[PDB]
Amino acid sequence: ATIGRISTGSKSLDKLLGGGIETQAITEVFGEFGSGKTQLAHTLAVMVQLPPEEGGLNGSVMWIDTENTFRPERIREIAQNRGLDPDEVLKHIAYARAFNSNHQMLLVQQAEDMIKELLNTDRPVKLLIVDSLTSHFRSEYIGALAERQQKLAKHLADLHRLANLYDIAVFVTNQVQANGGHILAHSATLRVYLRKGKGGKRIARLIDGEAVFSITEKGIED
Ligand SMILES: Oc1cc2ccccc2cc1O
């Protein structure tokens, strides 16, 4: 398949990304608590449902939530301010809460079944969100870094396999602050560092210029 791109909602961030986040790729956004990673996830879950002329892929979404941070009412707001019907947008987001890191890993295998079911339809899965990818692994494997890295490596390999095999954009969030961070090392296809700037602006930079955007009723925008 050709590489599809999903607009983030911000022209600035899209330019930094070469058009948007890519299918057949894992995009990892990392930054401190409150930097806007989950807002970007919510915005992408709407944008992907637009037609390509508007920066989407007419796609369905699957969302694995590890921190109870998915907000359907926020999806509704972004959808209504992106000219989409909010009910239709929510009907095309499959949502699961991961109870722990092992359940999170099983959910990726379960996601493959729905991906296959929708593959030949007019609304194939085009976006798989894992928010937060690392939170359960970090809490469960305190003092056991080597084992944590083994499990994360398999989890990321599973996500890679889905991105490439089914032409999906995988978007994962990772909280990194004071003294923290192996990030995801070199595993993601693309690492985006997100941070707060003056006056509530958000700033993004590729790791391995800078885009600037705001959180608004449209999700994010310039
Ligand atoms: O109904 C489902 C929703 C999911 C969401 C995320 C990952 C896997 C899922 C599997 C489902 O059957």
Side-chain angles (χ1 to χ4, degrees):
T2 61
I3 307 300
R5 292 189 176 258
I6 306 166
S7 173
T8 64
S10 163
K11 288 186 146 48
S12 186
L13 183 55
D14 285 354
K15 186 65 182 176
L16 188 69
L17 295 170
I21 72 171
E22 292 185 331
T23 65
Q24 303 172 54
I26 297 176
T27 302
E28 166 193 8
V29 179
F30 74 90
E32 300 193 335
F33 179 88
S35 57
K37 302 182 298 293
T38 293
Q39 293 305 321
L40 179 53
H42 280 81
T43 303
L44 285 163
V46 177
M47 296 300 296
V48 69
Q49 307 200 36
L50 289 166
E53 291 71 24
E54 307 297 337
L57 297 171
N58 285 306
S60 291
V61 182
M62 302 190 74
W63 188 308
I64 300 171
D65 187 351
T66 73
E67 300 182 311
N68 193 32
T69 46
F70 175 72
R71 296 290 182 269
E73 299 314 305
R74 180 58 171 148
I75 297 294
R76 286 185 177 277
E77 177 180 44
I78 300 169
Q80 203 87 77
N81 291 283
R82 292 277 172 180
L84 296 169
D85 179 66
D87 283 351
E88 283 300 304
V89 169
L90 282 164
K91 284 176 188 170
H92 294 85
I93 300 168
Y95 174 73
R97 183 57 157 57
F99 182 84
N100 63 21
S101 73
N102 289 324
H103 182 223
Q104 184 179 327
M105 297 186 52
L106 186 63
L107 282 167
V108 172
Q109 299 151 234
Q110 284 180 264
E112 186 166 9
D113 292 323
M114 184 176 184
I115 290 162
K116 287 171 180 174
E117 297 178 315
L118 295 173
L119 189 61
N120 300 311
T121 74
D122 287 327
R123 302 296 307 273
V125 176
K126 290 287 140 179
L127 177 63
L128 169 59
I129 288 161
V130 189
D131 180 15
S132 156
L133 188 144
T134 48
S135 63
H136 285 318
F137 290 93
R138 186 170 297 123
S139 64
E140 292 167 26
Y141 293 91
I142 295 295
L145 182 55
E147 165 71 347
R148 190 190 84 167
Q149 299 309 86
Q150 288 269 347
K151 285 289 203 303
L152 273 174
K154 192 214 162 25
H155 188 46
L156 272 286
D158 292 339
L159 290 168
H160 273 103
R161 194 185 55 86
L162 293 184
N164 293 120
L165 183 53
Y166 299 112
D167 189 31
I168 291 165
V170 175
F171 183 82
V172 305
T173 72
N174 181 17
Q175 182 180 109
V176 180
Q177 52 200 51
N179 201 39
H182 306 78
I183 305 174
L184 282 176
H186 221 46
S187 183
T189 308
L190 183 63
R191 288 152 289 278
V192 182
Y193 170 44
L194 186 64
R195 74 191 188 264
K196 283 185 171 176
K198 182 174 78 168
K201 293 290 187 184
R202 301 306 195 272
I203 308 160
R205 186 188 206 123
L206 303 184
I207 306 305
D208 311 318
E210 282 181 332
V212 178
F213 58 86
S214 296
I215 315 301
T216 73
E217 72 268 41
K218 293 187 76 88
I220 70 166
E221 70 184 289
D222 284 353

